[PDB]
Every structure is written in C-alpha cells, then in structure tokens.
C-alpha cells in the first residue's frame, strides 16, 4: 500500500507519496536510514533471515507480517514483499524494491 526502495544494505533510498500518512515520517526523515531502525525487537531477527534470501535469490521474497516503528513511536503492522536487482556487470545491488502492505 506504499511502496520503498532500499540499498544492498536496508537504506531508505525512496518512499512513495503514501508512506508519510502510514508510517509519519517525512521522507527527509526517513530516507538515508537503514530499516533496521524501525523493525520491532521481537520481528527484527526473522526479518534479517528475509533481507539475507533476498540479496542471494533472483526471486520476490515476502516477509512475516511484522511491526514497524511510526514517527509517534508506535507500531504498524505491515507486511513487504522485496525483491533485489544486481548489477550485472558488478554484481552489487543497485536497489531492493519493496511493496509495503499495511494492515
């Protein structure tokens, strides 16, 4: 329902024009960060499992529906779906593109 892009590494390279309603931090806020600042403790480790799949397999990979920390410092719950592109000439990843559903 807002969709993100992340380095190789989780950084907030972009959010769409419907993150800042769901999640409240103005895209200066939020863009640079990696999204390990916002997991929830207890969803963080399972959610590392999933970005490590998906920097290894050419393939989408859907995460557990977890909590994310908003701006009030409350939780949402979402649920992403991620998927890397490398460059085929480095093999660095250019960009994770991220579909950010919101429950």
């Not at 970005?51 to 949402?76: A, G």
Request: aromatic fraction near 14%.
């Amino acid at each position: 329902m807002f969709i993100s892009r992340h380095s190789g590494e989780g950084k907030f390279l972009f959010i769409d024009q419907r993150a800042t309603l769901v999640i409240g931090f103005l895209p200066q806020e939020i863009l640079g960060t990696s999204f390990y600042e916002y997991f929830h403790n207890e969803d963080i480790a399972a959610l590392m499992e999933s970005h490590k799949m998906v920097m290894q397999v050419p393939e989408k990979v859907t995460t557990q529906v977890y909590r994310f920390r908003c701006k009030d410092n409350s939780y949402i719950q979402l649920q992403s779906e991620w998927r890397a592109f490398k460059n085929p000439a480095t093999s660095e990843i250019d960009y994770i593109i991220a579909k950010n559903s919101v429950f």
